[PDB]
Design an enzyme around this catalytic site. Structure first.
Site, PDB file in Angstrom:
ATOM      1  N   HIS A  44       0.810  -1.247   0.000  1.00 13.53           N
ATOM      2  CA  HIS A  44       0.000   0.000   0.000  1.00 13.53           C
ATOM      3  C   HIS A  44       0.833   1.283   0.000  1.00 13.53           C
ATOM      4  CE1 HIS A  44       0.224  -0.102   4.456  1.00 13.53           C
ATOM      5  NE2 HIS A  44       0.395   1.204   4.256  1.00 13.53           N
ATOM      6  N   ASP A  93      -0.675  -7.511   1.463  1.00 15.14           N
ATOM      7  CA  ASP A  93      -0.009  -6.217   1.631  1.00 15.14           C
ATOM      8  C   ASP A  93       1.459  -6.436   1.920  1.00 15.14           C
ATOM      9  OD1 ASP A  93       0.230  -3.454   1.684  1.00 15.14           O
ATOM     10  OD2 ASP A  93      -0.623  -3.227   3.703  1.00 15.14           O
ATOM     11  N   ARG A 163     -15.527  -6.469  12.966  1.00 17.76           N
ATOM     12  CA  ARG A 163     -16.814  -6.835  12.365  1.00 17.76           C
ATOM     13  C   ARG A 163     -16.937  -6.056  11.045  1.00 17.76           C
ATOM     14  NH1 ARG A 163     -22.971  -5.598  13.333  1.00 17.76           N
ATOM     15  NH2 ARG A 163     -23.860  -7.674  12.946  1.00 17.76           N
ATOM     16  N   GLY A 186       2.388   6.470   9.270  1.00 15.54           N
ATOM     17  CA  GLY A 186       3.818   6.599   8.993  1.00 15.54           C
ATOM     18  C   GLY A 186       4.636   5.401   9.446  1.00 15.54           C
ATOM     19  N   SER A 188       3.566   2.198   8.761  1.00 17.84           N
ATOM     20  CA  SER A 188       3.238   1.148   7.787  1.00 17.84           C
ATOM     21  C   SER A 188       4.436   0.708   6.923  1.00 17.84           C
ATOM     22  CB  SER A 188       1.990   1.505   6.993  1.00 17.84           C
ATOM     23  OG  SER A 188       2.305   2.393   5.934  1.00 17.84           O
TER      24      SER A 188
END
Ligand SMILES: NC[C@H]1CC[C@H](C(=O)N[C@@H](Cc2ccccc2)c2cc(-c3ccc4[nH]nc(O)c4c3)ccn2)CC1
Length: 238
Positions: A44, A93, A163, A186, A188
């Site tokens: 991402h 990812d 959920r 920041g 990630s």
């Protein structure tokens, strides 16, 4: 990182800061050194990144202030994104950055071990999330690398907390029921590092979550053990 503390220099020598040059130079994501020409990060991070030419990888950095125009960095030769990747919330990812030059290993920069296939059954009790990300929802990128010890949570427990989402076995979650400590904006692409038998393993890649360090909202991470064959596929290509 929310609720963390400053890291010591050389504490997370696999931790890198991935900077972008377009439009201006800024920290984009974290990443991990996994091989002498390989960075493991989140797919991402590359949304709208049309070229690897705009990327700069900085290793051996404690403080963002160490980065100036004269600071050495690694150029990116290739961005390899998992081909099943659509979005962080759906999984896959994971991305690899092939560097233009070789990382010389030392006390400031070295690789983290990937988990073993046999280690899918091991219970990690000493896990840490690191990064230069925000300390609260609206903040700025931190100068000093932050660290926070976070307990791993079962997929069943993480699914109750999310959920409307599908928490797959290719995802791994970490957080306290009451919140307080987590990855934030920041962080990630960075590592979720777990020490087991005196050896650190790259258990997760900081991916997504609902807010930062909220009660009953653990951080969601790419479950690295589930991608060892994909990593070897891309790094050991003949
Ligand atoms: N509780 C669990 C965690 C898990 C990780 C999540 C996360 O970090 N998501 C990313 C997704 C992304 C979006 C765009 C590019 C790369 C990654 C993100 C990053 C930033 C960001 C990055 C660089 C920056 N430089 N300067 C800035 O101000 C600044 C801010 C802002 C908003 N979202 C947050 C929740």
């Amino acid at each position: 990182i929310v609720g963390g503390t400053a890291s010591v220099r050389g504490e997370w020598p696999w931790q890198v800061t991935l900077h972008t040059t377009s439009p201006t130079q800024r920290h984009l994501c974290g990443g991990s050194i996994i091989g002498n020409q390989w960075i493991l990060t989140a797919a991402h991070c590359f949304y709208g990144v049309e070229s690897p030419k705009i990327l700069r990888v900085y290793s051996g950095i404690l403080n963002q202030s160490e980065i100036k125009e004269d600071t050495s960095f690694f150029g990116v030769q290739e961005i390899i994104i998992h081909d099943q990747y659509k979005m962080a919330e759906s999984g896959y990812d994971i991305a690899l950055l092939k560097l233009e030059t070789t990382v010389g290993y030392g006390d400031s920069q070295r690789p983290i071990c990937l988990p073993s296939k046999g280690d899918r059954n091991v219970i990690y009790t000493d896990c840490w999330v690191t990064g230069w990300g925000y300390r609260k929802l609206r903040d700025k990128i931190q100068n000093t690398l932050q660290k926070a010890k976070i307990p791993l949570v079962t997929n069943e427990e993480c699914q109750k907390r999310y959920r409307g989402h599908k928490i797959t076995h290719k995802m791994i979650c970490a957080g306290y029921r009451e919140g307080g400590k987590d990855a934030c904006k920041g962080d990630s692409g960075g590592p979720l590092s777990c020490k087991h038998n005196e050896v650190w393993h790259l258990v997760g890649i900081t991916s997504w979550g609902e807010g930062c360090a909220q009660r009953e909202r653990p951080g969601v991470y790419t479950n690295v053990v589930e991608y060892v064959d994909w990593i070897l596929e891309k790094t050991q290509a003949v």
